[PDB]
RNA sequence: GUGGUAAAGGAUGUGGCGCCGCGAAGACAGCCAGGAGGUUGGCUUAGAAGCAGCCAUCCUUUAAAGAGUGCGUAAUAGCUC
């Protein structure tokens, strides 16, 4: 049960063996076909970036559930937005409408230790040096 | 301030001696060298020297001054001691009680017999280290059976004292 | 050269916005997990300042920098000056302390505090918590 | 290279001292009491300067190509009156003015201005911008 | 590698050493044989 | 702000004694009201670095004397570099010469693009302008880039304006890079 | 006899439909527009222990691998299943010795080749003042072009020098040239003269000119191959 | 053992000299625990979600705020700073 370990990822990928493979694998990690329940989040949420994570055991219990995102990718979900597939950063609109940000995110706080006060008006600019909602 | 502020416990014997400061301890009774330009202050038996001037070759002899004395008590309270551990998957060694042993070479009167303050101690079938009146040439003969086959740049077969997180490269590869 | 000016002065006041004073010397456990404390403000409060470790000499008698009156409490180790007037101090103050010990090597030790002005006795301090 | 169209063809001698002054664009360089240098060394500096701004931050070259050298024809002897070319090169004594603003900013050059102070035949000296001047 | 010349910190960090009036500069890195000398 | 302590010597031998003292030649000026005080290195030579000075006025100190002098000639080293005398006029009643400072803050019209940089133009204007007079003269320019720049045809300047130069010489430059 | 390590002949597709037409590497010169050689692969199936895979995915992009299907076997013990596509030849050299040391010579292999259609090969040759030389050139792919350059182009020199013309025989691979590989009567007359020093200098100098135009052949093949 | 016929360039040689980081609400260290809390890439995604080949130009803390210097490959770790 408590024998968790370090292993962070991304998911809504129906395709766990070209990523998520060499994690646990000889490391630990038994069985294979999370993709079934893959489903069980994959059909709508966790395009936020929101990984299970599984745990250790004897076998590899399933696929299941899925832990929410501190992510830089989360408070802006409504888009995935569209900038930065040629060349990161530059030209290719900084900008689209103020509140699309904060107006899709304000519920943006999940999982962290204890509490954050604000998703939205009183923190959502910080992550733009970590990306660019700047 | 911080250039001169030593304590100095045992009910040291050190006082100081036309170049050379008395001590007493395990065994103690030591002389450290010193240039009498500076001399020390000992009442009761303090270390707070004072210096002739402060140009900077006296400056830096501040520290000889300082350095040098203050372990020299340290020295003295125990059987001064480094601790040591050569360890690899073909060697051994035995404290015999009166010879070295270890085995590297391999084909091995290894032994040269112990100076003088210098005591082996043998802990663990590794972790062989030394301890006595010295540092310095504790610091000295220790490398000097260390300075019998030292490194690896591969393998660990290494003689060490607590070691350096060995450094560590490919042989053919890995 | 960095006097008493900027950068120490507006620290002076969520300790001065009214007087409700609290503080705490952690800081043994990683800021990766130590946030736990540092958000357990809001579930202690709102995002209070709650474990902010101010510098010593620059809050380690913060009452020379503003008149708080003397915070005699321990120089030792760092000083969070704690606004907990800046949150909303009662029975709240148990959830920042309660945290504190269950988590880390005492994720939140026990500290000097003053609600509204004059200290209360820091033996009292557990026991004011609720 | 960079010469052309002779008026003559050879000059005579001299060198002792002279005068150029402040910078063009508070990037540059200057030196001492300089021997003649040759052309390909000359233009060997934006040569050598060109790979390292940005490997293209543009610069303004500087000094303009000079005198005519030969050994005659090789080694032989003396008999000739004095004539042949190849090689050209500056007038070079009170520590010219090297010319090198660009915009590439900083270090960049600062060290390539070391790469042209480790180049070049003589010691030399580095300088920006100081104290202006006028002309009608 | 005694090198004749030049020496100028390329373990990065580095230190300038003085010794037997000799000088020169050692780092981390044995693949770092600054003496000029 | 300066001052300077005066010494009768001039022309030949002191100076290089007090050159030697780092104390400086100098200019006192005054519409034929002429003298020759001196001056002396570093500070006064820090008061050459202030940018806005050799244009922005300055007011040496004599035992008494409060006025404000502007730099125009001035001797230049080639033993080395730093200068070998500086000189000066104080204003007199209709100030005249005023070769007025210039800093450029011009539109980045071409580095986000093209990449050619602003290459400068004249450093600083040489504008007539009697005791009304602005630090940053400034020209905004949003035609530049490539080669070919545009021409100062805009000067636009503040209360005391006057095309004193020529009737416009070019604004600026920029540098192309691969003909690009 | 002599090892030449690998002899992969691959099979060459000609374009106006010439089927393999017998490949190999000196069968009919270069006609018409290759069709960028072409051929099969071998896929990777070869258990391992422990984590070797680090240097097996690098070294494995001997010829832009491409990771067929990573694997890991499950209730096992670091043993993994890594696969990669490959050619067959080139499977053949640099790969055995580096099988086991890349992996310390733990697990084997075992695969069926795989891949065709397109697979760049080019065809390096070489240059040698005569022309052809002996007979090398094969297809070089993955800038193999200067990568064996400097190895098999700086033959030594062919053992044997053969007059003092020094003939530069490059490597004509498909250039643009790639690969970069005499009397002493003139001091006689000694103490003077750097005039009739250069009359008698030219005297040769002009039988270089005549020599390795006339001096037909200068061609010294056939001695190591290597 | 400089006097003792040598350049270039190296040189925390050393000397004193003027210019500029003392912040005694006290520093740069040297130390010790933290060494970021939504600080996680659209272009590689073979992973980079600083620490290979691809942007750093706005907030939350303030203990400081490393856009992250570091060793490198299954991301990552893990040691610096």
Redesign the pocket.
């Given at each position: 049960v408590v024998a968790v370990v370090?292993?962070?990822?991304?998911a809504g990928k129906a395709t766990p063996a070209?990523?998520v493979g060499?994690?646990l694998?000889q490391?630990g990690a038994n069985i294979m076909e999370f993709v079934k329940a893959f489903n069980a989040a994959t059909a709508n949420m966790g395009d936020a970036?929101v990984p299970v994570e599984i745990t250790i055991y004897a076998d590899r219990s399933f696929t299941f559930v899925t832990k929410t995102?501190?992510?830089?990718?989360?408070?802006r979900k409504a888009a995935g937005?569209?900038?930065?597939?040629?060349?990161?950063?530059?030209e290719k609109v900084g900008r689209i409408t103020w509140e699309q940000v904060l107006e899709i995110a304000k519920q943006?706080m999940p999982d962290?230790?204890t509490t954050?006060?604000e998703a939205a008006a009183?923190?959502?600019?910080?992550?733009?040096?970590?990306?660019?909602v700047? | 301030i911080g250039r001169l502020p030593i304590p100095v416990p045992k009910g040291v014997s050190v006082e100081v001696a036309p170049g050379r400061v008395k001590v007493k301890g395990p065994k103690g009774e030591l002389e450290v060298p010193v240039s009498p330009e500076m001399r020390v202050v000992v009442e009761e038996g303090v270390v707070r020297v004072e210096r002739p001037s402060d140009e900077?070759r006296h400056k830096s002899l501040h520290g000889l001054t300082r350095t040098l004395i203050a372990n020299a008590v340290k020295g003295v309270s125990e059987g001064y001691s480094k601790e040591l551990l050569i360890k690899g998957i073909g060697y051994r060694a035995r404290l015999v009680g009166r010879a070295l042993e270890l085995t590297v070479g391999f084909s091995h009167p290894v032994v040269v017999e112990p100076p003088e303050g210098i005591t082996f101690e043998v802990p663990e079938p590794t972790r062989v280290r030394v301890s006595g009146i010295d540092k310095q040439k504790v610091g000295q003969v220790a490398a000097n059976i260390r300075a019998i086959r030292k490194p690896s740049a591969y393998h660990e077969k290494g003689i060490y004292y607590a070691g350096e997180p060995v450094r560590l490269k490919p042989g053919k590869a890995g | 050269?960095?006097?008493?000016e900027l950068?120490?002065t507006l620290?002076e006041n969520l300790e001065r916005a009214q007087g409700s004073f609290f503080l705490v010397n952690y800081?043994?456990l990683?800021?990766?997990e130590?946030?736990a404390l540092?958000?357990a403000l809001k579930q202690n409060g709102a995002?209070?300042?709650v474990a902010?470790?101010?510098?010593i000499?620059?809050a380690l008698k913060e009452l020379?920098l503003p008149e708080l009156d003397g915070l005699q409490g321990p120089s030792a180790v760092?000083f969070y000056?704690d606004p907990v007037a800046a949150a909303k101090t009662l029975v709240q103050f148990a959830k920042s302390n309660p945290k504190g010990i269950p988590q880390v090597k005492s994720g939140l030790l026990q500290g000097q505090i003053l609600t509204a002005k004059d200290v209360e006795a820091l033996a009292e301090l557990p026991t004011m918590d609720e | 290279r960079m010469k052309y169209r002779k008026q003559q063809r050879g000059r005579l001698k001299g060198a002792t001292k002279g005068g150029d002054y402040v910078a063009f664009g508070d990037y540059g360089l200057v030196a001492l009491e300089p021997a003649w240098i040759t052309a390909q060394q000359i233009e060997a500096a934006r040569v050598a300067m060109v790979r390292h701004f940005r490997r293209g931050g543009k610069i303004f070259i500087r000094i303009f190509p000079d005198k005519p050298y030969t050994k005659k024809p090789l080694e032989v002897r003396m008999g000739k009156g004095k004539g042949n070319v190849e090689g050209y090169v500056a007038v070079v004594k009170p520590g010219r003015v090297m010319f090198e603003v660009a915009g590439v900013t900083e270090e960049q050059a600062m060290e390539a201005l070391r790469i042209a102070g480790?180049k070049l035949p003589i010691?030399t000296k580095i300088v920006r911008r100081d104290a202006y001047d006028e002309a009608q | 590698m005694k090198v004749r010349?030049?020496?100028?910190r390329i373990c990065d960090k580095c230190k300038?050493i003085?010794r037997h009036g000799r000088?020169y500069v050692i780092c981390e890195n044995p693949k770092h044989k600054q003496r000029?000398g | 702000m300066e001052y300077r302590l005066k010494a009768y010597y001039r022309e030949g031998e002191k100076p290089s004694a007090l050159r030697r003292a780092g104390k400086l030649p100098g200019v006192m000026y005054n519409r034929h009201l002429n003298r020759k005080v001196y001056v002396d290195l570093?500070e006064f030579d820090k008061v050459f670095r202030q940018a806005s000075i050799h244009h922005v006025i300055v007011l040496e100190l004599p035992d008494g004397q409060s006025l404000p002098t502007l730099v125009r000639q001035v001797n230049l080293d080639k033993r080395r570099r730093r200068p070998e005398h500086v000189d000066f006029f104080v204003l007199s009643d209709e100030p005249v010469e005023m070769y007025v400072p210039l800093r450029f803050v011009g539109t980045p019209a071409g580095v986000r693009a093209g990449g050619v940089l602003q290459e400068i133009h004249r450093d600083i204007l040489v504008k007539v302008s009697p005791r009304n007079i602005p630090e940053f003269i400034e020209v905004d320019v949003s035609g530049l880039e490539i080669g070919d720049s545009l021409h100062a045809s805009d000067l636009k300047l503040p209360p005391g304006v006057e095309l004193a130069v020529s009737p416009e010489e070019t604004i600026a430059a920029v540098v192309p890079p691969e003909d690009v | 006899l002599i090892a030449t390590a690998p002899s992969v002949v691959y099979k060459v597709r000609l374009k106006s439909g010439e089927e393999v037409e017998v490949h190999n590497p000196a069968d009919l010169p270069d006609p018409t527009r290759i069709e960028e050689i072409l051929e099969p692969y071998v896929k990777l199936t070869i258990f391992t222990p422990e984590?070797y895979?680090?240097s097996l995915?690098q070294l494995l992009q001997e010829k832009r691998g491409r990771?067929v299907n990573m694997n890991y076997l499950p209730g096992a013990q670091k043993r993994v299943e890594l696969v990669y596509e490959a050619p067959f030849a080139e499977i053949l050299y640099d790969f055995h010795d580096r099988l086991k040391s890349v992996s310390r010579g733990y697990a084997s292999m075992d695969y069926e080749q795989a891949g065709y259609r397109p697979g760049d090969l080019v065809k390096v040759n070489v240059l040698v003042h005569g022309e052809v030389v002996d007979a090398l050139t094969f297809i070089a792919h993955r800038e193999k072009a200067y990568t064996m350059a400097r190895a098999i182009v700086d033959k030594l020199a062919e053992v044997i020098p053969r007059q003092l013309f020094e003939v530069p025989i490059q490597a004509a691979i498909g250039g643009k040239i790639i690969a970069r590989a005499r009397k002493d009567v003139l001091a006689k007359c000694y103490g003077g003269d750097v005039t009739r020093k250069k009359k008698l200098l030219e005297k040769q100098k002009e039988g270089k000119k005549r020599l390795k135009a006339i001096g037909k052949v200068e061609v010294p093949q056939e001695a190591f191959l290597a």
């Open positions: 370090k292993l962070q990822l991304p070209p990523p060499p994690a694998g490391h970036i995102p501190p992510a830089s990718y989360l408070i937005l569209e900038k930065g597939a040629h060349k990161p950063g530059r943006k962290l230790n954050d006060l009183r923190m959502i600019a910080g992550s733009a040096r970590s990306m660019g700047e | 900077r | 050269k960095r006097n008493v950068l120490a620290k800081q043994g990683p800021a990766k130590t946030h540092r958000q995002r209070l300042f902010k470790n101010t510098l000499r620059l020379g760092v000056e | 480790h010691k | 010349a030049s020496v100028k300038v003085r000088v000029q | 570093v | 984590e895979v680090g995915m990771l």
